[PDB]
């Protein structure tokens, strides 16, 4: 609220900045004959860490100021869900 943002803006930024883009090739088929270079173009790849998610850029304020994901949210690894918790003889466990 302090930054006039919603979850919609968060979701949009994540989809835009945690992306894996097919970007094509330099010198791909059909080429101009005589082409010596053939190379993949690599653009955005998926983020791999909480630090990267934290620096996702939600918006830049009119005064040049930056609003990042970590300024409106906590970022951490955690379960897809938290409904299932197991113990083995009283001690924290997991299982199959």
């Amino acid at each position: 609220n302090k930054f006039q943002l919603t979850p919609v803006d968060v979701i949009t930024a994540i989809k835009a900045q945690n992306a894996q883009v097919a970007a094509g090739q330099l010198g791909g088929t059909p080429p101009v004959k005589g082409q010596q270079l053939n190379a993949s173009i690599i653009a955005q790849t998926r983020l791999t860490s909480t630090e990267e998610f934290g620096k996702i850029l939600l918006k830049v304020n009119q005064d040049g100021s930056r609003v990042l994901l970590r300024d409106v949210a906590k970022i951490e690894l955690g379960g897809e869900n938290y409904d299932i918790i197991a113990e083995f003889n009283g001690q924290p466990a997991s299982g199959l």
């Binding site: 894996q20 883009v21 097919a22 970007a23 094509g24 090739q25 993949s40 173009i41 690599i42 790849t45 998926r46």
Partner: protein, 144 residues
């Protein structure tokens, strides 16, 4: 289309593989993801497995993964086949009057011969050596 190998692997292969479970008689699974944009995942079964059921079991798992795949991968069509890995035969096509080019011949083959050969019983897979025609819009960034 246009995907590099890591994009293919992390956006397509890993997703299908993670969905490959509860498949009877599976000995092992292997896959390649390449900078052509292409994936192949091979599931090898115990001898005497019914290949109809194997194909059925594999595709039932794949269908769970499909909505999770990129829209462009879905629209290229993904396929599930039960065949030998070597070629049974190669049917060649030429033009003895040289009145059709490599591209012409390939399109004639794709558009007139391939589907019926693909629907023929015992034919597990068909590779076109060439390509069907498509409407090609070749863009110019200057004029754009």
């Amino acid at each position: 289309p246009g995907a590099d190998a890591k994009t293919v692997q992390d956006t397509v292969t890993q997703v299908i593989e993670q969905n490959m479970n509860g498949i009877d008689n599976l000995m092992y699974m292997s896959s390649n993801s390449d900078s052509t944009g292409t994936v192949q995942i091979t599931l090898t079964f115990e001898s005497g497995t019914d290949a109809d059921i194997a194909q059925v079991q594999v595709q039932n798992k794949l269908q769970l993964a499909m909505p999770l795949l990129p829209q462009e991968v879905q629209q290229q069509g993904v396929s599930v086949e039960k065949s030998s890995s070597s070629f049974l035969m190669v049917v060649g096509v030429i033009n003895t009057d040289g009145t059709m080019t490599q591209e012409d011949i390939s399109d004639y083959v794709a558009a007139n011969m391939k589907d019926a050969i693909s629907r023929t019983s015992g034919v597990g897979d068909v590779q076109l050596f060439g390509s069907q025609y498509a409407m090609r819009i070749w863009m110019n960034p200057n004029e754009l």
